[PDB]
């Protein structure tokens, strides 16, 4: 039909809670696409970072991983509509633990090309967000990659692919952004830095999200929001929370990802 209009019209849902969790579509709707994350930015190692797709045609998306500590959190994002877009196929990939200088690479299934997506690089431990980064996948390619940055130890990505001739695909563009990041600042009441994910000129938002990553994800559940359709940008401030022990500062990173379409 028309991919930008269809994706814009579909309903976005962004859910935070203990993992695995689930996010539900509004009554009468089913998943078109989405992802579920397990994240923990305090515990050591990288096993607590995971992304999976939300399979289409289900009334909800179930998450992944376990609630082993209070710092384990789920973040689930879905786009819901009356029915699936069968031409869409989702792909996730992740690196092994201790990924080193390894670039993560995932390809679309045969005869499909990227609609959009993003990749994240992370490191565990209470200071691991110092190594956080996000990159977008690029519409019209057959591949998406994520390279390590600033001492990261794991890469993961999620993307959506579609049959290469699908109407309107050309009108789409992906933007990911890392906003303010570093030590959290409890002195900044709901103003602890920001992320501002901007559409390129003459485009407006189809869908997307903004999130605050935080050493204690369980204290920033409200800082995970869908991005407003047809706006020129998507903005979020940091909560300003810091539960670091004694002199330690919790870390945070404000980030997001959008797809925009031509107006
Ligand atoms: Cl510190
Ligand atoms: Mg693009
Ligand atoms: Mg930037």
Residue numbers in the entry: 810 to 1072
Please give sentences taken from the publication describing this entry:
Escape from the PV, and therefore from the infected cell, for subsequent rounds of infection has been shown to be dependent on the perforin-like protein TgPLP1 (T. gondii PLP). The MACPF domain forms hexameric assemblies, with ring and helix geometries, and the APCβ domain has a novel β-prism fold joined to the MACPF domain by a short linker.
Comparison of the repeats with one another indicates a root mean square deviation (RMSD) of 1.28 to 1.56 Å over their roughly 80 residues each arranged into six β-strands with four forming one face of a sandwich and two the other. The two sides of the 4 + 2 sandwich forming each repeat are linked together by two highly conserved disulfide bonds, which can be treated as a signature motif of this domain. Among the other notable features of the TgPLP1 APCβ is the presence of a long projecting loop at its base, which is tipped by a tryptophan and has additional sequence features that make it resemble the similar loops found at the base of the CTDs of perforin itself and the CDCs. Complementary to our findings from MD simulations, we found that the wild-type protein had a preference for POPE and also for PIP3-containing membranes, but that binding is reduced by mutation of the extended tip (MLWL→AAAA), by mutation of positively charged residues to neutral ones on the bottom of the domain (K→A, R→A), and by mutation of a histidine in the loop to alanine.
